[PDB]
Amino acid sequence: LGGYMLGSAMSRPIIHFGSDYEDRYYRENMHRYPNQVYYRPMDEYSNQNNFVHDCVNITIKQHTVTTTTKGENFTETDVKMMERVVEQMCITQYERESQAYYQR
Numbered sequence: 426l427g428g429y430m431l432g433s434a435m436s437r438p439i440i441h442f443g444s445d446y447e448d449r450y451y452r453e454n455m456h457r458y459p460n461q462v463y464y465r466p467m468d469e470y471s472n473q474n475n476f477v478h479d480c481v482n483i484t485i486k487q488h489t490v491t492t493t494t495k496g497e498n499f500t501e502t503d504v505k506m507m508e509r510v511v512e513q514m515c516i517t518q519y520e521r522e523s524q525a526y527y528q529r
Contacts, residue, residue, distance in 0.1 A: 438513035
């Protein structure tokens with residue numbers, strides 16, 4: 426990373442895949458999943474969804490490196506479920522900082 430950073434943790438977003446199976450599938454292991462999200466300052470630009478689609482990429486990439494380095498690797502469904510959890514959290518982490526620009 427070397428620029429991009431980590432702010433706050435959250436609650437685990439209860440995702441909806443539409444299958445209660447896949448809810449509880451994540452939910453059985455959810456403590457092992459991510460609980461904070463990697464973002465960067467606006468500085469120049471911002472979007473509504475596309476910088477979130479950037480931030481999600483970084484958080485999964487990091488976990489696919491620095492925790493995969495700890496032996497703890499993931500499958501693609503594990504990634505896709507993370508992408509959801511991380512996007513959900515990134516929406517709030519974006520909005521929290523974005524509201525502070527508005528408050529200026």
